[model samples]
Target: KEFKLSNGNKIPAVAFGTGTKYFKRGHNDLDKQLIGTLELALRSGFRHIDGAEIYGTNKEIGIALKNVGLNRKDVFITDKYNSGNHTYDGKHSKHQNPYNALKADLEDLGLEYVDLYLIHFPYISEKSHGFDLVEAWRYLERAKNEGLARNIGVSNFTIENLKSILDANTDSIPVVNQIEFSAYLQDQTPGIVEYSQQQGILIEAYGPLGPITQGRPGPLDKVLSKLSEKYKRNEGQILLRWVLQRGILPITTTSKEERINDVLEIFDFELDKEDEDQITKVGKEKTLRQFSKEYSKYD
Candidate 1:
């Protein structure tokens, strides 16, 4: 499945996320197991990979891409420039240059350029060297002009934050906004979805299945279970389906090969209106955000 971005480029509806905790320390840069796992995802039909500079798995991803034997043009790679790491005590340091960071990411991933490059966070830390979001965005635009990043976007940004960037720059608009999205967190910046849609910017969900996979069983679970039976699919499938039905792209990752393949199987069925309404209603009844503490208060 594919979706069109505001820039008129195509993005895969689902991306194989490599940001999960599994890619953390102890995994060597060229670990065969990690490479094999990614190879499996590719063989299983995932062409979009959501990776980042901070994940420490870029090198492994590079190797995996080579080992998979697919033409580089066949895959869609999205990477993020880690704003926090490049900044120092409250000011924009030369080290924080987005161009350099993107180049490093490409070097690590053995790629010439990425399909999409995103600002990982909307804000830098208090100790951040006066990190300027607009400046970062300008650099992103420059990278786009230089042909380093095909498309540019942001993650963890609210409607206001996005608007500020959009208002400041007249020549380019962000093509996508990635966030922690799920029915449970629907109330958090609910207008963001509508605003992004109105602007033709695609909203990508990083953890659409997180509520069911990480949180305790709740009303949403019951709704998903019911919908699963109604649709003859599993709860996970139901959750992903709901996200896609909303016209949002979902990024998911799994160490298990079967589950990885299972996530993509959601395309076979569609959720009915009543079920969608029920989930939406329950999702708004009580707000739940699996992730937000780190980036929410940045503004």
Candidate 2:
């Protein structure tokens, strides 16, 4: 049903997300659509929800959650700290506090504690960002200890960033690393998937449908089509299920009614590991210019 975290907590294998329309949009106003979609996702068997401070829809989603009338504890929310309060340069301001940031997230979601908290990115845009992830991570550790967040992790972190957090010698190891992932861009980040797995960091995928929706006209088209027919699922279904099969979690959002109604059907089947290599290595030889070009710096 869920994957066990390093902290011995269980996180659902898949999560429903609102990022399809909210991410990078900078909209915080109330919308019935956002509220309705969340309520629908919950009743549809999506227990885990992906949220972030930057997404700015938590308060509305909070409203939707109550309408569902489910126990608060049953619906898991994994959120991100978009504002950093800690600094590596020994300079600090109340504005950069991840501790305070999480409190805001909780209030936005009407929760006392979030299931998981994460630093949104390895670095921020402050000229150099001071590369203050370690400082923010230290604060997240403190937040977790105080029960403000159950488990804490990072997103878009490189091996070096993960090592930096480990180098801090904190007892808390990051249980998850959410990243822009799809079979289409597996090679773009070098060895992130294998390295994260070896480190026991669960790789939660965001933008998991890059091949079908973003990187079209590629080899994965044929591969996914063949697998979908074989497995009796949609090509999109194969993409997400394949992520789970690889021992990673996926965060997905699609408004297509058929998709919304059927995404949960992936649990009924599994993909063969023999054919898994077909996807694990398919992107090595080819990647769309749009995806690889945008994130090429990772390599």
Candidate 3:
């Protein structure tokens, strides 16, 4: 599934998430890990691969792309600009200047241009820095115009920050707004999704599985157990299906090959109207989000 952008571009609904544990500092075999993961995802028929400059595996991603035997245009690569890059805190690195940072992202990944480039998060501050985020968003728009990035968007954004961006440049709206959304960690009213739809900005669901995918759970387990017997699908598949029913482009991942393949199996089933209502009820009863921080108010 893809949604058309204001600029007449289309973005993939499901993307291969590359934020694996291999990117951790002590992962001694990051090269092997990166290449292996990319190969697995590619062979699994995933054309949209999400990576970031800060992931520290861009070099490996480049090598994997070289070995995968696919043209650059065949893949939709999403690279993100980290928050620390352009902070007023003065912690500038080589990849900090808005333009230079994007150039370095391409160079590191060995890609000519990324399909969607995102501002990782709204740079939060004690005072109002949503204005800076708007300024930086414009810089990304400039990057898109210069051919460094084909499209532009934001991640971990709040509606408050989006209002600022839209208030400043109505014509230059972001192509996507990625945020914490799912049955367990759902944010934004249903009308917000409608609002983005009207604005031509797609909603990229980051944590579509909720907080318990990493082992935390309450109603998820109960709902899954009951629904597993009722629907013959696991709890997770049910959760994923719920989000899908909500018109979200859910991106769920797992390092386990079996689990990853199983997640892909969800497309075969559809939730009934009553199932949707019941699941929503269960979700409300069991909602527990993971990325709840004070800074999230910036969105």
Candidate 4:
């Protein structure tokens, strides 16, 4: 499942989000879990793996990729420079030494180049006391030009941020926008998604399975269950089909072989226009506050 980016680069529709916020938070043996999960993900048929230097798991992911022996051309490897690491001067952000980081990633994974690289956040506090994301983005552009990254993009950005980045760079534009998307949180209010589609950015859903990740049950689950029973498909399958209908990519990160098997089982069904309309209504009818912890008060 490859989605064509705005820049014409092909990206995997599904990518593994390698870190868990709390349960696996700050464990000393974190690398082991990452390697295991990554190996599990690859063996289970996932072609993309998303890891950031900030996540502290890139090297481990690289190790897992090597251990699995996945051909470089067959996999899409994405890494982001830590948002806080953006600095005044360097091949990459934060003056953290791009050569060093790239060497480490290559050494760990036994690969030559990353398929994609992204700026991890919209703002970094230390530099300019947080004025704009341009400085970090400039470095990302340079990474692509230098052949350090095959493609460049951003994450967690608003429409304004993306427009500004594009306006600032005359030569390059973003190929992807990795944001929170699911049946429950469709990103319709801000008009960012519609704009991204028009602008040729591939929308990558980071939290595609809303219910499983958020702990609270999404309204979609009930609707999907009904449809699943009607269609004789799993709820997850129904959910992914909805995403595909929306022209966005849905991805899941699970270590279990059963989970991956469940994911691959989704290709058989198609939702009719009536089903799509019902799913859309279900999404609109529910008002879920998933990102309230940090972004709740943002206007």
Name the regions of candidate 4 deviating beyond 4 angstroms.
Answer: 21-24, 27-30, 84-108, 125-132, 212-218, 289-293
Candidate 1's residue-wise lDDT over 178-233, tens digit each?
A: 98888877624648888888899899997787668775567777777778777888
Tens-digit lDDT string for candidate 4 (1-299)? 67887667788776777754412345535467658877877887888888776666766777888889977788998887655523432222443543445556656556678888876666544344333467657667677888878998877777987887878845788888877777667773377788888988888776667654563565666777789889887777787778878888775667666877777665556799899878878876655545423444432
lDDT of 3 at 184: 60
Question: 1 or 3, which is superior by lDDT?
Answer: 1
Give every collision pair in model 4.
85-94, 86-94, 87-94
Please estimate how well model 3 matches the true structure, expressed as its whole-model Cα lDDT.
0.69
Off by over 4 Å in 3: 26-29, 85-94, 124-131, 188-198, 214-216, 295-299
Score candidate 4 by TM-score against the native.
0.85
Q: Model 2, 126: alpha-carbon shift in Å?
A: 9.4
lDDT of all predictions, in order shown?
Answer: 0.80, 0.77, 0.69, 0.70
| All candidates: CA RMSD (Å) | 3.0, 3.5, 3.6, 3.9
Q: What TM-score, computed on C-alpha atoms, does each candidate reach? A: 0.91, 0.89, 0.85, 0.85
Winner on lDDT (2 vs 4): 2
Q: Name the TM-score of candidate 3.
A: 0.85
Considering TM-score, which of the candidate structures 2 and 3 is the better prediction for this target? Answer: 2
Regions more than 4 Å wrong, model 1 = 23-31, 85-94, 124-127, 294-299
